[PDB]
RNA sequence: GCCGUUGCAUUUUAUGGC
RNA sequence: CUAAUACAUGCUUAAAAUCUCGACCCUUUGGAAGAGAUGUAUUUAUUAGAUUCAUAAUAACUUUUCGAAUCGCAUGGCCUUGUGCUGGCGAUGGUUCAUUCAAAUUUCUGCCCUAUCAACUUUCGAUGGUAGGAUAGUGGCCUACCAUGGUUUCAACGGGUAACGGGGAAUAAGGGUUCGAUUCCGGAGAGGGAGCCUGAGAAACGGCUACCACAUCCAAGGAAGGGCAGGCGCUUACCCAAUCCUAAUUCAGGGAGGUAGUGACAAUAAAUAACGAUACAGGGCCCAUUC
């Protein structure tokens, strides 16, 4: 990846180089994830060089969602738990009110799960069904109530399902793409749109409405009462 | 830090212990008292430093040690003062105490054996020392200089840090706290400036309110600001100044204009208002003490909202020109250096009770 | 030798690299462009580890003279200087051999 | 610490002049 | 002459093994005659799908494919000790799916002017359907049959803009200048031709064979490169320390990248002196060229 071709949510300025760290192939997309090299020296700033990254990578300080991933440019995406065992830090990757990834230091058991919207449900080999989440993870043997547009609280010590929340009106949403990235308000109503592009209307606790696609609507809980500690700013914008 | 010690009401003022000591010097310019047993240091225009012990609150300050220079030390690398010493300041470790005056040098002294441990040339014919102020719990010397400078030293290593420029007349008064900032006045430019040492910036507050507009006030219901004589820092967010016409100006760091100005304090006696010749606040408190040659130290209580201040009272035990105020505690012991004339060699008129010495006043609770 | 008075600010504990980063300030009245060697000596006596546990670089001086600001480093041990430092600075400090090719 | 004056009688305490 | 990282060979373990059920007995922390069943790739056919996809059996198919003779940290567990079972930590391949990176087909939107351009296309596919071939893939994409069709007046098509195309970068009327040879990509060509290859991704010419122009060497048999850049006409060196990419990959590399040469059409600051002192000496200077 080249510079002035890197996306805006990495917060990198026009000087200092010619190329950008291209996100590697992985469970997340290239456009809505932030690489590990961009995470530690450009957000947390505790390294200074690109060479200083690989020294930290080969000392096993870091692990993403319980797994180390000691590649330079691994695409850590949304709801990912980056864990610094040295100095005892835990992190959750969440967007700002402007669309950029935020640092939110989380607790020790809030770092023991994540929330995964399932993308698709099909009947696998030998009669067992399976769900496929948005973060490149598959879970076989699901609860048969779980279908598409449902988020799943994931165990993170095993690949098993601990909780699921169905896509309903009045359940705590979070925008994951588009112009309205980073807003909350649990649902106004739905539009069918036979032919795709399904519009879900959201009005916040500060009583203002907006329109996003069904692509971007990611529920995280019930009204009020979230299932993850939200940063300051509260997605109200 | 902000103002938190609220004890203006607790001060029993009317029965404060008042006493006075006559000393063997003419025209004592300053007094500086250490608190870690408590010490005291006095310099006069008779070329002398004198060390007192004031750890016993019921007693007058008894004599420990004293040192007087002479005309031997005419050159400027001599280890002694050969002219009037205008200010004195003790280091917060109790190990050194430095003097300087019209001999345009800076002589650091040992508190133990009273020996000249350092002499520093200011290297300017206009680099006269006027006020030395130490940062609280530090050794970074702030030196007001008559060539419109502020010179910053270190004590433990005896070096020079940096110099601030900017004023338009002679910097008389400078006050500091434990942070790295200080307030200065230029005393005829009719402004005061706040100095951030690492930021190397200044914030300039402006006096000079015309009494003509006050004559508008005289239609609604005085005297000229000509010389901002003293400045004192109450907290890191506000300060005060004392003028040549009885007005005492309260200042906020968010206010370009005076957030308060008190009208005539020590009074008059066409007519002549008294000069605000001394001004010293108790640190991080709401209480401050202003002094004149009128004969009574007037003490004032800052309001809780930092918007006005109110009279605590008057202490009439000290007749003569009050040059410098020191306040120590444990109870409270007030010391005041009373000289026969003003600090600057200035002329004084018809003073009742011409005497030289130290005022002491103990206030309980 | 004019009371060097090396001042340090911006101290942040960095235990994941086992170090403490801080901006070195070098006031030097009547003294010009002192060293890289004496600086590592005289800031290791406020942290009290060793000379070769101290890295330093940078230092574009003030215009005219009398002030110099660079960038300083201190580690927890000698072996950390052999792992966490760049390869040419250790040759510069003397702690390594530059295999020329 | 120059002088005067008062209570303890001067060390102690208070006041006037240079 | 002779090795393996070469070629051809075979258990899937204590008699296979593991699962369910069971006429009955007994209450249980249970036990039984007998009764059923089990890995897997390719092509076609049938049927279930109640609540042709998945899933399954069925009947055949293929050169009938696979089925752990593995690797390291340690020289590993266990008994009266058997050709024993395999392997404490985690490592590779193989079966199959999704994802990621992409790649390919596809929807809509989007530039000047022009009727002094009113009809365009068919024919040997233009339009539709049938069926077949072809490809990684649905599809007139291609071929045989049948029909005579499809677009268009708030405008199809024909035609000019010497700007190879836009997103974009500066002055900042948005009209405009410059670049579009663009910072990102798309079309062309590597002497000209046809055929052929590798890789998931090339139509590779900065891959191969052959044909054609075409020249260099010759010991006279034969062997060989593709007519190219660069400069004048108006002297070009060093280094992977940073960014990113690659790695037999914490080593190093990069005709990626970074660092010195070149100077009156212009133009930029200011140096070539500053301050004192005395004895001699005056017909010294200006205006009317005048008087």
């Amino acid at each position: 990846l080249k510079r002035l071709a890197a996306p805006h949510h990495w917060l990198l300025d026009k000087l200092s180089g010619c190329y950008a760290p291209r996100p590697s192939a992985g469970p997340h997309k290239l456009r809505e994830s932030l690489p590990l090299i961009v995470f530690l020296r450009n957000r947390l700033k505790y390294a200074l060089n690109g060479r200083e990254v690989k020294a930290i990578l080969m000392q096993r300080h870091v692990k993403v969602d319980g797994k180390v991933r000691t590649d330079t440019t691994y695409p850590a995406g949304f709801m990912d738990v980056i864990t610094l065992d040295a100095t005892n830090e835990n992190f959750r990757l969440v967007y700002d009110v402007k669309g950029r990834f935020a640092v939110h230091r989380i607790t020790d058991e809030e770092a023991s799960y994540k929330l995964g919207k399932v993308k698709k449900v099909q009947l696998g080999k030998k009669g067992v069904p399976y769900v496929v989440t948005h973060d490149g993870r598959t879970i076989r043997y699901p609860d048969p109530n779980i279908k598409v547009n449902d988020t799943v609280k994931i165990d993170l010590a095993s690949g098993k399902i601990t909780d699921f929340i169905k896509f309903d009106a009045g359940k705590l949403v979070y925008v994951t793409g588009g112009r309205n990235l980073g807003r909350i308000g649990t649902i106004v109503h739905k539009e069918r749109h036979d032919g795709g592009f399904d519009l879900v209307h959201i009005k916040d606790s500060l009583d203002n409405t907006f329109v996003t696609r069904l692509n971007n609507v990611f529920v995280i809980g019930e009204q009020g009462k979230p299932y993850i500690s939200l940063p300051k700013g509260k997605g109200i914008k | 830090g902000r103002v938190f010690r609220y004890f203006g009401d607790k001060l029993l003022i009317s029965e404060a212990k008042q006493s006075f000591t006559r000393v063997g010097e003419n025209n004592l310019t300053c007094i500086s008292c250490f608190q870690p047993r408590l010490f005291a240091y006095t310099v006069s225009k008779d070329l002398q430093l004198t060390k007192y012990d004031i750890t016993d609150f019921s007693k007058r300050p008894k004599k420990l040690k004293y040192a007087k220079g002479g005309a031997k030390y005419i050159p400027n690398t001599t280890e002694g003062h050969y002219d009037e010493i205008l200010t004195v300041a003790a280091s917060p470790d109790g190990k050194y105490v430095v003097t300087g005056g019209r001999d345009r040098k800076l002589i650091v002294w040992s508190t133990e054996s009273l020996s000249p441990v350092k002499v520093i040339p200011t290297k300017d014919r206009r680099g006269e020392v006027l006020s030395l102020a130490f940062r609280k719990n530090s050794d970074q010397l702030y030196a007001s200089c008559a060539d419109f400078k502020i010179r910053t030293y270190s004590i433990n290593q005896f070096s020079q840090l940096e110099i601030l420029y900017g004023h338009h007349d002679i910097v008389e008064d400078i006050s500091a706290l434990a942070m790295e900032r200080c307030v200065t006045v230029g005393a005829r430019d009719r402004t005061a400036m706040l100095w951030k040492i690492p930021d190397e910036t200044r914030l300039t507050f402006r006096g000079g309110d015309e009494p003509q507009k006050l004559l508008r006030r005289w239609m609604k219901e005085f005297f000229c600001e000509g010389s901002i004589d003293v400045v004192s820092m109450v907290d890191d967010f506000h300060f005060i100044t004392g003028s040549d016409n009885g007005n005492i100006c309260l200042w906020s760091l968010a206010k370009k204009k005076p957030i308060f100005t008190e009208r005539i304090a020590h009074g008059i006696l066409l007519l002549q208002p008294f000069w605000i010749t001394s001004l010293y606040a108790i640190p991080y408190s709401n209480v401050f003490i202003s002094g004149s040659w009128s004969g009574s130290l007037k003490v004032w209580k800052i309001s809780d909202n930092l918007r006005s201040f109110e009279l605590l009272g008057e202490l009439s035990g000290a007749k003569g020109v009050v040059t410098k105020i020191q306040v120590v505690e444990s109870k409270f012991r007030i010391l005041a250096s009373i000289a026969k004339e003003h600090r600057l060699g200035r002329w004084i008129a018809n003073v009742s009770g011409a005497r030289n010495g130290i005022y002491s006043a103990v206030i309980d609770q | 030798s004019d009371a060097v008075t090396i001042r340090t600010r911006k101290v942040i504990s960095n235990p994941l690299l086992a170090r403490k980063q801080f901006v070195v300030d070098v006031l030097h009245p009547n003294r010009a462009n002192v060293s890289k060697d004496e600086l590592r000596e005289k800031l290791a006596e406020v942290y009290k580890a060793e000379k070769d546990a101290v890295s330093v670089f940078g230092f574009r001086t003030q215009f005219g003279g009398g002030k110099s600001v660079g960038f300083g480093l201190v580690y927890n041990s000698v072996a950390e200087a052999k792992k966490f430092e760049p390869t040419y600075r250790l040759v510069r400090y003397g702690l390594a051999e530059k295999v020329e090719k």
Side-chain angles (χ1 to χ4, degrees), chain B residues 19-23 25-31 42-44 277-278 291-293 295-297 315 317-325 334-342 351-360:
Chain B
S19 64
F20 180 75
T21 68
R22 295 178 294 177
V23 291
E25 290 174 351
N26 288 318
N27 297 318
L28 281 77
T29 53
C30 178
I31 183 166
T42 61
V43 293
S44 67
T277 63
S278 293
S292 177
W293 67 88
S296 66
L297 278 72
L315 279 72
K319 275 78 178 176
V321 181
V322 177
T323 67
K324 185 74 173 179
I325 304 170
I334 295 172
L335 297 176
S337 63
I338 284 90
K340 286 185 179 182
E341 290 188 354
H342 188 271
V351 175
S352 177
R355 68 187 186 179
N356 285 315
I358 298 170
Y359 174 74
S360 177

Side-chain angles (χ1 to χ4, degrees), chain A residues 104-217:
Chain A
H104 188 72
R105 297 174 180 88
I106 60 173
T107 62
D108 195 75
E109 192 63 30
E110 191 177 3
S112 299
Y113 65 95
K114 70 182 291 185
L115 277 81
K117 177 183 175 183
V118 293
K119 303 297 290 294
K120 67 182 74 66
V121 282
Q122 289 173 354
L123 198 281
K125 181 69 174 67
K126 297 182 186 291
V128 178
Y130 67 100
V131 300
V132 172
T133 64
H134 71 281
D135 59 353
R137 292 179 183 267
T138 183
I139 297 168
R140 296 170 65 92
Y141 291 99
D143 196 6
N145 290 321
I146 304 170
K147 287 183 173 65
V148 191
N149 298 321
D150 300 335
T151 185
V152 171
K153 181 182 174 183
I154 306 166
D155 185 76
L156 267 297
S158 295
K160 296 181 177 66
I161 296 169
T162 58
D163 194 3
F164 63 96
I165 293 94
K166 294 181 72 66
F167 186 75
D168 293 330
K171 291 181 174 62
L172 210 294
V173 302
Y174 185 77
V175 181
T176 55
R179 279 83 62 193
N180 298 318
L181 177 57
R183 297 179 69 86
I184 289 172
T186 70
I187 277 170
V188 181
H189 68 281
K190 64 100 179 177
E191 291 183 354
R192 191 175 184 180
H193 286 283
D194 286 330
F197 290 97
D198 305 334
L199 297 179
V200 172
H201 298 277
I202 305 298
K203 65 177 292 296
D204 53 358
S205 69
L206 204 65
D207 63 10
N208 288 313
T209 65
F210 66 97
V211 181
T212 50
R213 199 187 185 273
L214 184 273
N215 189 5
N216 293 322
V217 175

